[PDB]
Amino acid sequence: RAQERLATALQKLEEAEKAADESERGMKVIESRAQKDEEKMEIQEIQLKEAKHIA
Amino acid sequence: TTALVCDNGSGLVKAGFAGDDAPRAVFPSIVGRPRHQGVMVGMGQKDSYVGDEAQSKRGILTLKYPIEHGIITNWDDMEKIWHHTFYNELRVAPEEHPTLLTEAPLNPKANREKMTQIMFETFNVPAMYVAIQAVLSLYASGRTTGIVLDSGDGVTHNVPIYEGYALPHAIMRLDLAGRDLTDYLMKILTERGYSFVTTAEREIVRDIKEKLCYVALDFENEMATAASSSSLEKSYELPDGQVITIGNERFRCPETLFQPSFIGMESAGIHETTYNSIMKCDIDIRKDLYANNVLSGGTTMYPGIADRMQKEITALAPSTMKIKIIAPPERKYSVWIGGSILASLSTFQQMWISKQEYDEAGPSIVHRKCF
Amino acid sequence: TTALVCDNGSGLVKAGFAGDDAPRAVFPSIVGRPRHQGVMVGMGQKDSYVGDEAQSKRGILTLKYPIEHGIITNWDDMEKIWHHTFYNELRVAPEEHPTLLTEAPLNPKANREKMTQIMFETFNVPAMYVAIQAVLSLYASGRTTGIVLDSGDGVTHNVPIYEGYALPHAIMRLDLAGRDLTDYLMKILTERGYSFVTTAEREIVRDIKEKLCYVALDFENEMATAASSSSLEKSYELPDGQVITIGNERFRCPETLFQPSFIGMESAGIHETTYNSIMKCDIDIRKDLYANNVLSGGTTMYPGIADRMQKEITALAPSTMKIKIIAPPERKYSVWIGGSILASLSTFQQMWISKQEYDEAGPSIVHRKCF
Amino acid sequence: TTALVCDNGSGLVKAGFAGDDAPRAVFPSIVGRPRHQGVMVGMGQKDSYVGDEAQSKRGILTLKYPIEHGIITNWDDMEKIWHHTFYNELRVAPEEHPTLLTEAPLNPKANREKMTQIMFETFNVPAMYVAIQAVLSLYASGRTTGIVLDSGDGVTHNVPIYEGYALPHAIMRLDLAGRDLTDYLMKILTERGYSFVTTAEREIVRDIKEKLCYVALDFENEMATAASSSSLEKSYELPDGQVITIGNERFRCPETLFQPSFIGMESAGIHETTYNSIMKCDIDIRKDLYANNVLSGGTTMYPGIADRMQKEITALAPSTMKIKIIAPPERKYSVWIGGSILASLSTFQQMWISKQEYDEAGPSIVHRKCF
Ligand SMILES: Nc1ncnc2c1ncn2[C@@H]1O[C@H](COP(=O)(O)OP(=O)(O)O)[C@@H](O)[C@H]1O
Ligand SMILES: Nc1ncnc2c1ncn2[C@@H]1O[C@H](COP(=O)(O)OP(=O)(O)O)[C@@H](O)[C@H]1O
Ligand SMILES: Nc1ncnc2c1ncn2[C@@H]1O[C@H](COP(=O)(O)OP(=O)(O)O)[C@@H](O)[C@H]1O
């Protein structure tokens, strides 16, 4: 019984670690998406001010 | 009757039937041979394993690729690969099936000629045909206009097409691809003490690359953030243990596509050869080409490559033009999708190279109007 | 016809027929000669006793082993051993039976060549073959991969095999075995007053070792347990009477296998040469090797040696792999069992060295692909 | 002030002053510790012998090499090596001497980082610098182009240099060297009857190798010559008498450099990695590289290695090239000679890494333009 529960706890650890590291990858790609969003934002706000001043 | 669609490529054979949504047989194009002694009598072991079987016995075999950069350099190995694909992965008799094969632009002529000679004499198909990979990518993409960047495993190329007319003088071909990215990643992993020298460890490194590498949006800022923080470090577990920790070489590897000087090449990045193919085209179609920039092939599968290439091409092109990069999720199989579509088209049934045409005209029939 | 399987070993001869489940003749590999004068006329006594008879006449003879560490040092004695085995224990005519002999890895070549020359010239067998002990052990174990640790009485060796291919650069051989354990026990038994010096008291000490020694799962804790308690102290009754009591040297004797510095050797324990053989193999067969660690030979018969080996190799290898040690109850005879299997294989009947091949190519024909 | 050129190597430390014609101190990079108990009270044994003394007390020590394949694995042992070099062999105070250190291509970065951290903090040198061994070989050879093959004792590498510019993408490194040749010679002598197992017998085997081994011009013909004649056998005198006679083992050991499958490596010989580095280089400089093939390091010192490598590279290259192999008699010390030249150059005096720069920027300063 001790060995059985050892192995089951191990496989559960494996599953949890899979989920957690996939979430880490997702949050990293999301924060990169967010900085790219922000830089596109600054560029488009600047061209917005240009267009509005020239208009 | 049905046609087979075998997309060879340089490092992943994928085949199937014309009229399906996907290939039913995808395996590496490797041929392994045992390099050790062999002691157990009665084991009855073979002399060469091909395909996915050779991947389970990497620790015993020496792995060869029969296709270096598009070009086939080992015809015996390639004949073995084709035999395996026909009889063991697909289980079809190739004497009753037309076969559609693919190749990259600007290859030698003897490659294509010897390919058809094999397919008619050895495997004895009733008909066959060789297609350009970029055209099939464009079929599968649902377009008839666009510049397609097909980064495979041995060769990268751009092929601009407009309204179904291909502009051959603007085709670019570059010999930087996934195999060179794997070699560069092996070379820069040694900075942390990991060493992979065996042909069987090249596969471990390829899996590392596929699972962990990505394209940085800004290379200098990513280098700075990797130097400062430690939030980029990611671990990988080898077939044994000693989990390896990978830092900035997560994104220094695929950056070789945008800075080929990393591996000592003189040429320019993929963004710049794409832009150069554009500016090589006419002037009346450059807007459509900017708006229909199609990616395909396995080396275009890194996270962030679409955004990076859009940033670069947008910085290059004029400001009044809207750049767009089409990157489907099934990019790796686009050539096969397009090949299946094309071979199922009823108009195409007059374009095959029949066996009698070959018998009467020699293998030269392949560069002829029977393309 | 039937083949004989003679597992010479070093300190125990095991012979039989190919196709049986066990050897039918197991006797010590000793040759004794009388050392006293001999007074009774008409006794008609012999000049040299071989095998199990010498162990009866121990008190009168000097017992010599003709095999030191795998290597044969006395060819006349070894020829007597073989003659006894063929004619008195098995009762067969060796000119009608092929003979399969066994040998340890990394022995001199003249050993094997002279063995072949004897078997063809003196005993006149029709065919013969020399096999490696570890391979035959793996046959008998039912595996086809796995790293085998064959600790006999002369030598200890690891031989990693994967899919029937042996990796010769990773073969390890150590000259620590049961004979050295017997000598160490003779030496440390003098701390309690018992003195065994004669060549025939070594057999008594070997019996003590076999019947009372065991491997401690933890050496310092057993040292302290013996220093405090007396629950691990056991007794033994000599052929003379006068029982002897064995204390903590019940487990200090086989601990020499894990700490060869006890007998002044430089090398590392069996648990560490096994791991070094693993780490000298490839990277993508190490998981299978960790999971298929096979023990054979008489010196692996101690109680607790499998559990100790597992604890040690587990503390050595990475924490994410299942380390498993295969230790059958019929370990001591594994080499012979595998030899019988091999010689009965119908595929093997073409691997014999026939007599005509020898007559035409000399004894050098032994090192050919029949190696 | 004058600089110190310490080519720490891997298996031989070579030190001296910049501006000399040869190293002043040459001794093995070995740290020995006593492994027996020690009974004579009052003689005051020490706990670790380092250098040439450990070879005198070799019989009662365990010899460790602090550096395995270029890489340092024992930093405490390496600090002892350096301390011995500075104080007990050169008799200088490193607080007043710049120190040039040498390293192989493609090592971990922590190697250089810890090396400079130690040199600045433990030894307090005023400046230091880490150079590549192949560049220094090419200095000492009086060339400015050429492909240099530097075979030391842990690592072999090719570094193609043209006109003072190095081609980093063509640098090849191989982990087969003199230490693996010694291990193969041990393992291959065991088949003639001699066994050397201890770390103190490894040194005797290394001496046998240096003194009797050579490279065959034609391996198969020399094998047949040894199998038929007996004119190849030399005798060697062990440090206790009992001469040993070796036959084809003389040319079978260094043949591992040209067939690394002998020791179970998959890679290609040195003659083939040299040619592959050349073929990676640009097409316009391959003629000069073919003409300037420079050998250095102790493992390039066998008799016949230059002729063998010329035969091989000539059979590989096109038949219209002049293959030429430069093998000076002072090959073994080429790295040190070039290091002395470099450190004495007057242009070099602003390329040291000063103590101020280090205290400013941390050990990361090593990989900067001050390489
Ligand atoms: N998810 C991924 N990320 C990065 N590279 C990948 C990924 N998947 C595959 N690759 C690379 O793509 C290459 C295979 O591309 P593929 O489409 O098979 O070309 P080909 O069929 O011409 O060999 C492999 O070398 C692999 O390294
Ligand atoms: N139960 C046991 N416990 C410990 N040692 C044993 C046991 N049985 C046999 N041995 C040892 O094994 C040795 C014989 O091993 P064996 O397998 O016969 O090798 P070989 O056939 O080469 O002599 C003897 O020296 C004996 O001391
Ligand atoms: N005459 C020789 N023939 C063959 N090998 C030699 C000879 N002299 C030295 N060696 C080998 O060279 C190695 C030392 O090479 P060396 O130039 O000292 O490299 P490092 O300085 O990095 O140790 C030793 O292992 C030795 O076996």
Swiss-Prot record, chain A:
Q: In which tissues is it expressed?
A: Detected in primary breast cancer tissues but undetectable in normal breast tissues in Sudanese patients. Isoform 1 is expressed in adult and fetal skeletal muscle and cardiac tissues, with higher expression levels in the cardiac tissues. Isoform 10 is expressed in adult and fetal cardiac tissues, but not in skeletal muscle.
Q: Which residue ranges does the record annotate as region Disordered?
A: 16-36
Location in or out of the cell? Cytoplasm, Cytoskeleton
Q: Per the similarity annotation, which family is this? A: Belongs to the tropomyosin family.
Q: Which disease is it linked to?
A: Cardiomyopathy, familial hypertrophic, 3: A hereditary heart disorder characterized by ventricular hypertrophy, which is usually asymmetric and often involves the interventricular septum. The symptoms include dyspnea, syncope, collapse, palpitations, and chest pain. They can be readily provoked by exercise. The disorder has inter- and intrafamilial variability ranging from benign to malignant forms with high risk of cardiac failure and sudden cardiac death.
Could you tell me what this protein does?
A: Binds to actin filaments in muscle and non-muscle cells. Plays a central role, in association with the troponin complex, in the calcium dependent regulation of vertebrate striated muscle contraction. Smooth muscle contraction is regulated by interaction with caldesmon. In non-muscle cells is implicated in stabilizing cytoskeleton actin filaments.
Q: What is known of its domains?
A: The molecule is in a coiled coil structure that is formed by 2 polypeptide chains. The sequence exhibits a prominent seven-residues periodicity.
- What does the subunit section of this Swiss-Prot or TrEMBL entry state? Homodimer. Heterodimer of an alpha (TPM1, TPM3 or TPM4) and a beta (TPM2) chain. Interacts with HRG (via the HRR domain); the interaction contributes to the antiangiogenic properties of the histidine/proline-rich region (HRR) of HRG. Interacts (via N-terminus) with LMOD2 (via N-terminus) and TMOD1 (via N-terminus).
Full protein name: Tropomyosin alpha-1 chain
UniProtKB/Swiss-Prot annotation, chains B, C, D:
The superkingdom of the source organism is Eukaryota
Q: Which residues carry this modification: Methionine (R)-sulfoxide?
A: M40, M43
Localization, per the record, is:
Cytoplasm, Cytoskeleton
According to the UniProt entry, which disease involves this protein? Cardiomyopathy, dilated, 1R: A disorder characterized by ventricular dilation and impaired systolic function, resulting in congestive heart failure and arrhythmia. Patients are at risk of premature death. Cardiomyopathy, familial hypertrophic, 11: A hereditary heart disorder characterized by ventricular hypertrophy, which is usually asymmetric and often involves the interventricular septum. The symptoms include dyspnea, syncope, collapse, palpitations, and chest pain. They can be readily provoked by exercise. The disorder has inter- and intrafamilial variability ranging from benign to malignant forms with high risk of cardiac failure and sudden cardiac death.
Which gene underlies this protein? ACTC1
Isoglutamyl lysine isopeptide (Lys-Glu) (interchain with E-272), cross-linked positions: K46
What does the miscellaneous comment read? Answer: In vertebrates 3 main groups of actin isoforms, alpha, beta and gamma have been identified. The alpha actins are found in muscle tissues and are a major constituent of the contractile apparatus. The beta and gamma actins coexist in most cell types as components of the cytoskeleton and as mediators of internal cell motility.
Lineage of the species this protein comes from? Eukaryota, Metazoa, Chordata, Craniata, Vertebrata
Subunit comment: Polymerization of globular actin (G-actin) leads to a structural filament (F-actin) in the form of a two-stranded helix. Each actin can bind to 4 others.
Listed GO MF terms: ATP binding; hydrolase activity; microfilament motor activity; myosin binding
Changes after translation = Oxidation of Met-40 and Met-43 by MICALs (MICAL1, MICAL2 or MICAL3) to form methionine sulfoxide promotes actin filament depolymerization. MICAL1 and MICAL2 produce the (R)-S-oxide form. The (R)-S-oxide form is reverted by MSRB1 and MSRB2, which promotes actin repolymerization.
Coiled coil region boundaries = none
SMART domains on file: ACTIN (SM00268)
Q: What is this protein called?
A: Actin, alpha cardiac muscle 1
Q: Which organism is it from?
A: Homo sapiens (Human)
The Enzyme Commission number assigned here is 3.6.4.-
> Which InterPro entries does the entry mention?
Actin, Actin/actin-like_CS, Actin_CS, ATPase_NBD
